[PDB]
Amino acid sequence: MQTIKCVVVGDGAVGKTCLLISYTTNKFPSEYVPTVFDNYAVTVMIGGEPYTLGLFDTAGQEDYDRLRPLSYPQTDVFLVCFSVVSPSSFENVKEKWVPEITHHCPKTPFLLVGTQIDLRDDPSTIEKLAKNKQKPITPETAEKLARDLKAVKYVECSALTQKGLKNVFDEAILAALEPPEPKKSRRCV
Amino acid sequence: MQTIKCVVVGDGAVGKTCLLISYTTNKFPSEYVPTVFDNYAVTVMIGGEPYTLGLFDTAGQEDYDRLRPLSYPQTDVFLVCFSVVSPSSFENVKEKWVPEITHHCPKTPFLLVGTQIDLRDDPSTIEKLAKNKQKPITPETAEKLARDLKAVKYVECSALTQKGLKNVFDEAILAALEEPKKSRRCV
Ligand SMILES: Nc1nc2c(ncn2[C@@H]2O[C@H](COP(=O)(O)OP(=O)(O)O)[C@@H](O)[C@@H]2O)c(=O)[nH]1
Ligand SMILES: Nc1nc2c(ncn2[C@@H]2O[C@H](COP(=O)(O)OP(=O)(O)O)[C@@H](O)[C@H]2O)c(=O)[nH]1
Ligand SMILES: [Mg+2]
Ligand SMILES: [Mg+2]
């Protein structure tokens, strides 16, 4: 009916699934994260006419490297997710994710989404980080990464406390608004 | 999950493509052989943890000279191949290959690989060599060059009889085992 496909991507355990399910049901899956890689839909009211926002989840694990890209076709905006309290995923945004996306979808915009920020203050997570890199990604450093990789922008959220969250998706909606007739329509293919 | 990139280089017709295909499939391409712009990813088991061995082929032809190096980055070890029954390929190892490789990848180890050894007796090949060539590169001779050009070592094989072949890659595996002090990764 006038679609907006947004494919979520990011290392594993980064909180991709919880982020979507949280956004869509307004309830963080506090007992079992649905093990199914599913699409989601939300009828957004952009302007005056409704738009179908297609939220697509992905399987991050390496095993899916050769398959994952299959869902990429016709995407409008991407969300490269990384857990604010696991530098691991953050490094991968650069070394793995952004490249993959660009490779397959060169004209498709993408936002850098920091996830699990609520944990930026959970001591045990900090005490665990101890391994010298006992430092959770800060907005300061993530932002530059956005600039370098050319992300439309950096937005961060907590699927647990709902903080930001919706914003991430508004930013996703606004970044995806393809032009009118223009042969320059970033819709991936 | 933990790789070892191995790029094969050598003069055309040296038996590069069959060397790979035969090693990976266990059967010499008896009726078809591509040009290769392909990649083979055998799951090697080093230690206790699996390693993905990336076998990359290259188009040796002069035309590809400025482009072929595009695959060089991320390489752990090199295989400079030359067909034992074609001195031409041999000379090119020193004059062409090692340098090219050296310049591009100054820290990446490489191995001197003699190919098509089984031909070192096919009369026709021999009698054709008659034109100033009573000798197909002997291991001893190649070995010498190995020392000179500082290759990790000289290994030879016959993609046809698969003789030695497997060894070539083991040596390739052992040569590429990057300690964490200095990574010979071609940048
Ligand atoms: N007899 C023999 N010839 C070989 C062997 N491996 C390759 N060849 C010969 O190689 C020719 C082409 O070599 P190829 O592998 O296509 O050379 P490349 O382009 O250097 O990879 C084939 O037509 C031959 O059968 C081998 O071990 N034994
Ligand atoms: N505390 C906290 N845990 C989160 C948050 N978002 C995700 N998780 C957790 O992250 C882990 C994996 O998240 P999932 O959504 O399953 O990650 P995926 O691999 O990216 O789909 C689980 O422990 C979730 O309980 C968040 O904002 N807060
Ligand atoms: Mg998931
Ligand atoms: Mg070839």
Coarse DSSP helix, strand, coil percentages of chain B, rounded to the nearest 5 percent: 35, 20, 45
CA angle, B166 then B169 then B171, to 5°: 110
One DSSP character per residue, B119-186 reads: GTT-HHHHHHHTTT-S-PPPHHHHHHHHHHHT-S-EEE-BTTTTBTHHHHHHHHHHHH---TT-----
Question: How many secondary structure helices (H) and strands (E) does chain A include?
Answer: 6, 6
Closest ligand to the CA of B19: 1
Instruction: Find the distance separating the first CA and the last CA of chain B, reported in whole Å.
Output: 20
Candidates A167, A164, A161, A87; CA nearest to A118 is: A161
Q: Are A101 and A108 in contact (CB under 8 A)?
A: yes
Task: Evaluate: CB of B164 within 6 angstroms of ligand 1.
Answer: no
* Pocket probe mutation, ligand 2, options A8, A16, A23, A33, max atoms within 8 Å of Cβ: A33
The Cα–Cα gap between B16 and B11 comes to 8
What spacing in Å lies between the alpha carbon of B124 and ligand 1's midpoint? 16
Q: Are B6 and B46 in contact (CB under 8 A)?
A: no
B63 in a labelled binding site: no
Candidates A60, A37, A79, A72; CA nearest to A175 is: A79
Q: What Å resolution does this PDB entry report? A: 2.8
Residues preceding gaps in chain B (C to N > 2.5 Å): 178
Give the strand pairing for B110-115 and B77-83. parallel
Task: Evaluate: CB of B187 within 6 angstroms of ligand 1.
Answer: no
Query: Which amino acid type is present at position A32?
Result: Y
The Cα–Cα gap between A127 and A120 comes to 11
Which CATH class for the A2-189 domain?
Answer: alpha beta
Burial B167-178 (b: 16+ CB within 10 A, else e): ebbebbbebbeb
The Cα–Cα gap between A81 and A153 comes to 12
Solving technique for this entry? X-ray
Q: What length does chain B have?
A: 187
For A89, the token pair is 């995923």
Burial B72-93 (b: 16+ CB within 10 A, else e): beebbbbbbbbbbbbbebbebb
What spacing in Å lies between the alpha carbon of B85 and ligand 2's midpoint? 61
Q: Are B149 and B99 in contact (CB under 8 A)?
A: no
Give the strand pairing for A77-83 and A154-157. unpaired
What spacing in Å lies between the alpha carbon of B36 and ligand 4's midpoint? 6
Task: Name the residue ranges covered by the structural domains of chain A.
Answer: 2-189
The Cα–Cα gap between B73 and B38 comes to 16
Ligand 2: list residues with CB < 6 Å: A 10, 12-18, 33, 60, 115-116, 118-119, 158-160
Q: What length does chain A have?
A: 189
What beta strand segments (E) does B11-144 contain? 39-44, 51-56, 77-83, 110-115
Element at A5 (helix H, strand E): strand A3-10
Q: Is B2-187 CATH 3.40.50.300?
A: yes
